[PDB]
Amino acid sequence: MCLKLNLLDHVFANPFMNAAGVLCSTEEDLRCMTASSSGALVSKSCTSAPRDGNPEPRYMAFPLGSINSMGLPNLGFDFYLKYASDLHDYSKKPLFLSISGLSVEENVAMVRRLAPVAQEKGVLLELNLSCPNVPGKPQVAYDFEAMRTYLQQVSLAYGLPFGVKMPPYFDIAHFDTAAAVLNEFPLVKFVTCVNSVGNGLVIDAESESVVIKPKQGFGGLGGKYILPTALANVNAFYRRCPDKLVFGCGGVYSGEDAFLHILAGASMVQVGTALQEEGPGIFTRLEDELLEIMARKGYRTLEEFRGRVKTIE
Amino acid sequence: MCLKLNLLDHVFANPFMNAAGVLCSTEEDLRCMTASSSGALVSKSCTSAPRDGNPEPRYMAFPLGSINSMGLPNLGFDFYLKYASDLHDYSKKPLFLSISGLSVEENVAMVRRLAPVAQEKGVLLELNLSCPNVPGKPQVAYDFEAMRTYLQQVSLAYGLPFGVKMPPYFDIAHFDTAAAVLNEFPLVKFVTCVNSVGNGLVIDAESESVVIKPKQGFGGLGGKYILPTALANVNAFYRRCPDKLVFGCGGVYSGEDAFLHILAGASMVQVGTALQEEGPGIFTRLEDELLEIMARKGYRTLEEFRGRVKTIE
Ligand SMILES: Cc1cc2nc3c(=O)[nH]c(=O)nc-3n(C[C@H](O)[C@H](O)[C@H](O)COP(=O)(O)O)c2cc1C
Ligand SMILES: Cc1cc2nc3c(=O)[nH]c(=O)nc-3n(C[C@H](O)[C@H](O)[C@H](O)COP(=O)(O)O)c2cc1C
Ligand SMILES: O=C(O)c1[nH]c(=O)[nH]c(=O)c1CCc1ccc2ccccc2c1
Ligand SMILES: O=C(O)c1[nH]c(=O)[nH]c(=O)c1CCc1ccc2ccccc2c1
């Protein structure tokens, strides 16, 4: 009994991977993720130039989850490309490279250079749409006409199947609009739902203070706080994008949580906060737990139950 | 040491009240909230005509919060107007009446008839801007032009101070835009942040099923899930609306949670999910708990710490 699966012309030992941004910034991190029992890894979202990111403290975690305003600290695209091209051992597991340029031009520039490496090595692109937009405007994925432009320009520039990392939505009409944008692009083969729930605020009662320094304490939420949000987005896009895969991310701490993601429609299941907190050993626990729940239910495959969440009447 | 507040030309023994929708639909419910130690009460969001609401099950609760798609079940405006005009004992505490017309014209018709009762008895209006509007459009407060229309029309028709109940926002550009719309309306004297976090999905692993029947299991989230999101919204509007009060709602289960709201900027503190779960006895507990935190810190009044959350450097 094993959890192996095939997606996107790659084979995976199991559906688990890190979430972008967690345990994936440096060569050390990527080698640690590659040594883990995860089925795949994704690199830290990158920009063309290296970034220091925001002042510390910029991440904090608590029993119910985490908050962050990292500010896209990363080693720069040339580093992640070199890692994909020369350093990653593809015999161990697939690699996803995450890009988050500050403009459409920057994304085009990076994807033109990634294309030949994707062809030669099979690295997979995850395009992070929680990225900077023009004056007055919300993040790109919350501006559907900007989103359409990014995807048009990246599709043309890259020319190969890729995925998109989405922020959560909270309104059925937004689900409908966003999925219709995505379904305009045949090269968008997977949608990862969700990025952190934007601009929450954690306050420490004793100190009477916010707990992260940037943005007056406001930052993206992950962990237990966000699991029903994440399940809703996974299922909403699973229903709306039948020709695409959905990757679930948000609130996974156990095999049971992974089970719920898969029942909602998830093909791969990403682990952010709980991975940051527990470390890469989590992957063996999650695999064991998921297999245990499958066994108790009589499921032998993921495909027996993926997307098969039941509704009432 | 005391929890008293004076605002909106009323006096409140303490800042706690029910959140709209919870323990406020029937005369029995309203009498119960009136008999409780809460500092105020709000009636169930109403429509002109009575509504049965959505099929059951339509509310469920769990350790980390609740999900609902109640569908605005209510006894109709005339009932809530009568309660305000003839039944409520204003010597016990103040009363808010929440309205949630399905169109701007339905809201105008109701506010026109509320006005004289507001003027004579002092009932306070809370306009719910999570009213669905046209299906396939976002809820009203996620459509800034609709929101502006609603506020213009209601301000003209009512002519008296009122407040608004807001959904959470997740993007700084939305906080900026939403507050700016509200700040166009001088009669909007309070802003209640937040309504439920929209379209979450809870899935029960044993049964492999969603837990509520409407909308394929999608519904609004409350409780522990939503506290950092609620805090963020309270503080975002507190900072952006210096001539308005903010009332906090979301995730309050303890005096400490209430303290965090109030440090964020809350004047009144509303209690939804935890009240639904625990019953009106929660109000004595919350008061005691908040007074205990005040005593430890040496705070004698709420205003000593309201809005006084610290940021880092
Ligand atoms: C410290 C940190 C850094 C992150 N950086 C990124 C990033 O570079 N790119 C990205 O797509 N998402 C990023 N995220 C979002 C996560 O990939 C994930 O979507 C989010 O944390 C929700 O999953 P979780 O509940 O498992 O934490 C980051 C999250 C954290 C906590
Ligand atoms: C069962 C139920 C009914 C609700 N009905 C309404 C309503 O009629 N009007 C409204 O403004 N908010 C309504 N809400 C939202 C609550 O007022 C509140 O904003 C939300 O539950 C978050 O607070 P909490 O975390 O304390 O539950 C309802 C919530 C619940 C759980
Ligand atoms: O690095 C982050 O703060 C981060 N945290 C998340 O929870 N999700 C993300 O997607 C990101 C990075 C998003 C991002 C993407 C591009 C950015 C560009 C300039 C400044 C900040 C930028 C931030
Ligand atoms: O009555 C509700 O379902 C409700 N629940 C909340 O968590 N907050 C709200 O503001 C409301 C009332 C607004 C509302 C919310 C959902 C609805 C679904 C179908 C039909 C009408 C609806 C009206």
Q: What can you see in these coordinates?
A:
Chains A, B: Catalyzes the conversion of dihydroorotate to orotate with fumarate as the electron acceptor. Molecular oxygen can replace fumarate in vitro. Chains A, B: Its cofactor is FMN. Chains A, B: Pfam families: DHO_dh. Chains A, B: This is Dihydroorotate dehydrogenase (fumarate). Chains A, B: GO terms for molecular function: dihydroorotate dehydrogenase (fumarate) activity. The structure is a homodimer of 313-residue chains. Chain A has 313 residues and is an alpha/beta fold. The first copy, chain A, has 2 domains: 1-53 and 72-196 and 223-313, Aldolase class I (TIM Barrel, Alpha-Beta Barrel); 54-71 and 197-222, Dihydroorotate Dehydrogenase A, chain A, domain 2 (Roll). The first copy, chain A, has helices spanning 27-35, 77-87, 104-121, 144-158, 172-182, 227-240, 255-264, 273-278, 282-297, and strands spanning 5-7, 10-12, 16-18, 41-42, 59-62, 65-68, 95-99, 124-128, 162-166, 188-193, 197-201, 203-204, 209-210, 218-222, 245-249, 266-271. An 8-stranded parallel sheet of chain A has the order 3-16-15-10-9-8-7-4. The first copy, chain A, has a 4-stranded antiparallel sheet with strand order 5-6-14-11. In chain A, helix 2 packs parallel to helix 3 and helix 4 runs parallel beside helix 5 (172-182). The longest helix of chain A is centred in the middle third of the chain and has 18 residues, at 104-121. At the A-B interface, helix 5, strand 11, strand 13, helix 6 and helix 7 of A face helix 5, strand 11, strand 13, helix 6 and helix 7 of B. Bound molecules: flavin mononucleotide (2 copies) and the ligand O=C(O)c1[nH]c(=O)[nH]c(=O)c1CCc1ccc2ccccc2c1 (2 copies).
